[PDB]
Amino acid sequence: FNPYTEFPEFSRRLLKDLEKMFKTYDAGRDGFIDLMELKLMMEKLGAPQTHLGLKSMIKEVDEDFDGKLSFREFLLIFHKAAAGELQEDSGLLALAKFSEID
Ligand SMILES: [Zn+2]
Ligand SMILES: [Zn+2]
Ligand SMILES: [Zn+2]
Ligand SMILES: [Zn+2]
Structure with missing residues (x-):
């Protein structure tokens, strides 16, 4: 998996910020x-x-x-949010909006 080619619309800073928040909530440290x-x-x-x-x-x-x-599926959430691909009532849109990233 290559996040730079899969998600070229993400800056390096955003990718690092999303890695940090993934690791923050993977309390069990299993990568999911x-x-x-x-x-x-x-x-x-x-x-x-x-x-x-x-x-x-x-x-x-x-x-x-x-x-x-997985991390790549977590990034996909934010890709869908920024691409306008999540419904206005999805819990995924709440996750992206309230994450306070970007
Ligand atoms: Zn976990
Ligand atoms: Zn999965
Ligand atoms: Zn439950
Ligand atoms: Zn159940």
């Missing part, structure tokens, strides 16, 4: 954000989600079907 870690992240950002809501959020970008977010 699972449902429980996303639950905690959404609470901390000020947009708590239901259990099924969190599952729907992950499913939107879960390209390898494992029910958790």
Whole structure:
């Protein structure tokens, strides 16, 4: 995976900022954000989600079907947000807006 060629619209600074926030919420340090870690992240950002809501959020970008977010799927959230590809009521749009990145 090459984030610079996959997401050339992201500055190096934004990529580093997104890596930092991925690592912040991967509490278990396994390289993924699972449902429980996303639950905690959404609470901390000020947009708590239901259990099924969190599952729907992950499913939107879960390209390898494992029910958790890899770093490349996390970046995809922000790519979709900036490209106008998330619905106005998606928990993913709340995640991107309330992350206070950019
Ligand atoms: Zn994890
Ligand atoms: Zn749950
Ligand atoms: Zn469940
Ligand atoms: Zn996944």
